[PDB]
Design a protein around this ligand. Structure first.
Ligand SMILES: Cc1cc2nc3c(=O)[nH]c(=O)nc-3n(C[C@H](O)[C@H](O)[C@H](O)COP(=O)(O)OP(=O)(O)OC[C@H]3O[C@@H](n4cnc5c(N)ncnc54)[C@H](O)[C@@H]3O)c2cc1C
Ligand SMILES: CCn1c(C(=O)Nc2cccc(COC)c2COc2ccc(OC[C@@H]3CCNC3)cc2)cc2sccc21
Lengths: 133, 666
């Protein structure tokens, strides 16, 4: 029913190697070439990647900032209100971004700010002028 | 098997069913009720058991009925029919047995047998047992044909047959009880030695032997499952199938590599895009850090836009570092897969040049077993006789296989040094013309009622003919002779004075250097009592080695043995014998094989007898006159001694039923 485990004998393979005389040597050569072709492409990318690896030498450690861990607060100071409006002008409805910019306001507090002061801060106009970018 | 059922097995018969031959002789029983068939079968099996329990004395009908008991002995004419059937067809009372009833006073019918090989000898023994006048014509100066034993002093070695292929169902088991044969088991272990003279490591010896056994099963799958039996209007040979299977294994090995390195470039190119994303992200961070720095240099107090600028740049710089902390994190997720694949590469090669040499040894051993290069064997039918292999170990005739045909020739009228030149068969009898092999001018004429031809297939193939048939053999007979294969293999006998090899090693091999020379002195035998080593020549080397002198062939043997055992340990043989079976005018080869384009049905064609045309036009249908026995005439046991032995018994029964009658059919 099936070939001995380890042999590979499909009906398709037999016909390609017996289609003529040197069809055996032809099939085994085009695979030898496709092997050499793939092997030299490996060393081309292995060298392209090795060059890109050296451009990253140093990581981004001289560019990381320390973690400013400030306790979240609930009262909106006049300063913090002004930070939020500009954050809306720059980030739109990205609540997590606005939360990080202000520092001590949760994601839902920023969303509550989007309604309480939507009247007095013209947040609709601020958002529509962000959509132009 | 045991009991009467073992008797049927030992006679190569189904113990619980009537055969086709039995159906022809007992059509009233096989078409009758089931009860009668079981009675008949037991009578047959019980009669066989009695003969096999004492093959040295003749089993008579009076004796058979005495050992039978009720209700099986209630019908006497049935018992008599079974006994006469078994005696006529060589199942009982065959070989060499002390006769109880002295032979008929005068004989009935004259039969000329060509060739005193085992085939012809067995038939001559039986036809004389049946009361006919039998005369054998042997071209050689000895009996046995391809059972040829060399004897000089204590040295005994067989140049022809020397192995009994199991005793389970072998008629030679009956013979070995009659003739004093010296049967010895062959220890299967067979170490190989490469051309360098050293042995093959157990690692390679098994991985290659298994790969050989695997490649063989592959060709059977190619044949019986993919129907790969024709290639450009020509029948596929076993050699071609092995070439195709090997190439597909080398082809799959290359496909495994290409798809493996293709996994590397795929993941390597995931890295190329991965790095190009971070080398550009590290650039955005390098710029954003400078912008956050410049915004932070603005010393307080500062309005809320300058303060938002520092908070904005801080947030964006933190976000870009998070994006880098992941793009560069997966950089190690892929870098592990790269050390994963580049550490588990698939097989580099299928078989190395050293491996392919050892594989060629197993091919040479197969070319030896079938006595022909694998390029000539039929892919579909070469092993058609495998389903009838006997049970038990293979044994050698240690005292020389010639003792068997010599023992059969006792009492027969054999005419040695008589080469048949012409076989004339007509509606009213036959005449055989033969000349004396020593002076070919002395001509003999033998008139007879029937001729039994046991000429080797290689002789029947000669062009121009060594034996002329008049009238010519019909096309269907000659076409079979041309389709059938007749191979070749030769033995080199190296006698010695002392044993320098391993006594417990019955055989060892020599791995040749080239695919072409793989059968040249590839196998050595230590199977005899006296210090005799015996070397084999097989495959394409067989035919080519016959064109080389003995002193040069023995020179290559000593050169090989000096490699394995050392130059100091190999002495001179003092006696050498080399066979040349294809050059033998009386054999023209070794034995038959199922050539590509042929089948086992050609063996059956070879066995069919020839019937001459009517003398007077309008005369009744004549009687078969020319009969064929021999190794090449028995479909299930060709190329053997027991096959020739059986074929002779077969024709002896047919010739007797034709010229003496068969009173066991009503
Ligand atoms: C090297 C070798 C090893 C073998 N080993 C084994 C083995 O181990 N086991 C096994 O079972 N079988 C073996 N065989 C095969 C076995 O020996 C044969 O199948 C068997 O002996 C053939 O018997 P036969 O009577 O049919 O043919 P033969 O024995 O050849 O009888 C034919 C006879 O006819 C004679 N003859 C030829 N031409 C003429 C003529 N023109 N006129 C008159 N007579 C003629 C020949 O001389 C010969 O005596 C081996 C064969 C060979 C060559
Ligand atoms: C090859 C000669 N030969 C042999 C022979 O030499 N056997 C041998 C010798 C030493 C060691 C071993 C190793 O012990 C197992 C063996 C058995 O190997 C075999 C080879 C061929 C066989 O069959 C050959 C016929 C030819 C056509 N169909 C079958 C059977 C066994 C046995 C038989 S039966 C007909 C021929 C023959």
């Amino acid at each position: 029913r099936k070939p001995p485990k380890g042999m590979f004998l499909s009906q398709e393979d037999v016909e390609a190697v017996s289609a003529n005389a040197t069809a055996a040597t032809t099939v085994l050569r085009q695979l030898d070439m496709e092997l050499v072709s793939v092997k030299r492409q490996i060393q081309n990318i292995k060298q392209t990647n090795s060059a890109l690896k050296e451009k990253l030498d140093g990581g981004i450690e001289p560019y990381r900032l320390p973690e400013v861990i400030q306790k979240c607060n609930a009262r909106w100071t006049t300063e913090e209100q002004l930070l939020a409006v500009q954050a809306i002008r720059k980030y739109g409805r990205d609540f997590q971004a606005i939360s990080d910019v202000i520092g001590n306001k949760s994601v839902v507090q920023v969303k509550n700010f989007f309604v309480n002061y939507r009247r007095r801060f013209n947040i609709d106009e601020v958002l529509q002028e962000w959509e132009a970018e | 098997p045991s009991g009467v059922e073992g008797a049927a097995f030992q006679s190569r018969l189904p113990h619980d069913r009537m055969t086709s031959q039995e159906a022809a002789c007992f059509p009233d029983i096989i078409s009758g009720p089931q009860q009668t068939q079981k009675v008949f079968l037991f009578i047959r099996n019980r009669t066989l058991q009695l003969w096999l329990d004492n093959p040295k004395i003749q089993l008579t009908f009076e004796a058979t009925l005495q050992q039978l008991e009720a209700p099986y002995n209630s019908d006497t004419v049935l018992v008599h029919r079974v006994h006469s059937y078994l005696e006529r067809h060589g199942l009982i009372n065959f070989g060499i047995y002390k006769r109880i009833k002295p032979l008929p006073t005068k004989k009935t019918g004259k039969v000329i047998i060509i060739g005193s090989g085992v085939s012809g000898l067995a038939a001559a023994r039986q036809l004389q047992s049946f009361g006919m006048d039998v005369t054998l014509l042997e071209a050689r100066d000895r009996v046995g044909g391809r059972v040829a034993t060399f004897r000089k002093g204590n040295y005994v070695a067989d140049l022809g047959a020397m192995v009994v292929t199991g005793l389970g169902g072998n008629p030679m088991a009956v013979v070995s009880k009659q003739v004093n044969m010296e049967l010895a088991k062959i220890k299967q272990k067979c170490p190989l030695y490469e051309a360098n003279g050293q042995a093959v490591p157990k690692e390679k010896d098994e991985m290659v032997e298994q790969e050989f056994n695997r490649l063989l099963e592959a060709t059977s799958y190619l044949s019986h499952q993919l129907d790969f039996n024709v290639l450009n209007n020509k029948p596929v040979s076993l050699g071609q199938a092995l070439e195709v299977v090997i190439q597909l294994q080398e082809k799959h090995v290359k496909d495994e590599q290409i798809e493996h390195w293709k996994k590397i470039v795929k993941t390597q190119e995931e890295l190329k895009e991965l790095l190009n994303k971070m080398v550009n992200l590290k650039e955005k961070i390098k710029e954003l850090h400078q912008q956050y720095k410049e915004a932070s240099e603005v010393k307080p107090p500062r309005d809320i836009t300058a303060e938002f600028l520092v908070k904005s740049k801080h947030r964006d710089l933190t976000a870009l570092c998070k994006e880098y902390d992941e793009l560069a994190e997966t950089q190690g997720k892929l870098e592990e897969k790269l050390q994963e694949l580049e550490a588990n590469p698939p097989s580099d090669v299928y078989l190395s040049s050293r491996d392919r040499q050892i594989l060629d040894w197993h091919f040479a051993n197969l070319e030896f077993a079938n006595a022909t290069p694998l390029s000539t064997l039929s892919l579909k039918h070469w092993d058609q006789d495998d389903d009838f292999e006997f049970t038990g170990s293979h044994l050698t005739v240690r005292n020389g296989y010639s003792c068997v045909p010599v023992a059969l020739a006792e009492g027969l009228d054999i005419k040695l040094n008589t080469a048949v030149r012409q076989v004339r068969y007509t509606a009213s009898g036959c005449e055989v013309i033969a000349v004396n092999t020593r002076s070919t001018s002395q001509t003999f004429i033998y008139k007879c009622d029937a001729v039994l031809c046991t000429l080797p297939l290689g002789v029947l193939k000669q062009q121009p003919p060594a034996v002329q048939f008049v009238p010519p053999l019909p096309e269907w007979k000659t076409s079979a002779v041309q389709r059938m294969g007749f191979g070749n293999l030769n033995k080199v006998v190296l006698c010695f004075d002392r044993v320098f090899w391993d006594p417990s090693v019955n055989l060892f091999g020599h791995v040749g250097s080239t695919t072409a020379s793989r059968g040249e002195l590839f196998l050595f035998w230590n199977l005899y009592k006296a210090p005799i080593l015996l070397a084999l020549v097989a495959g394409e080397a067989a035919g080519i080695m016959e064109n080389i002198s003995d002193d040069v062939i023995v020179g290559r043997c000593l050169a090989i043995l000096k490699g394995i055992f050392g130059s100091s340990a190999v002495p001179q043989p003092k006696e050498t014998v080399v066979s040349r079976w294809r050059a033998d005018p009386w054999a023209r080869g070794s034995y038959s094989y199922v050539a590509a384009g042929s089948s086992g049905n050609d063996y059956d064609l070879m066995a069919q007898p020839i019937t001459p045309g009517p003398s007077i036009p309008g005369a009744p249908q004549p009687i078969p006159r020319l009969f064929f026995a021999g190794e090449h005439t028995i479909r299930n046991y060709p190329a053997t001694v027991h096959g020739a032995l059986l074929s002779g018994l077969r024709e002896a029964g047919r010739i007797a039923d034709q010229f003496l009658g068969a009173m066991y059919t009503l």
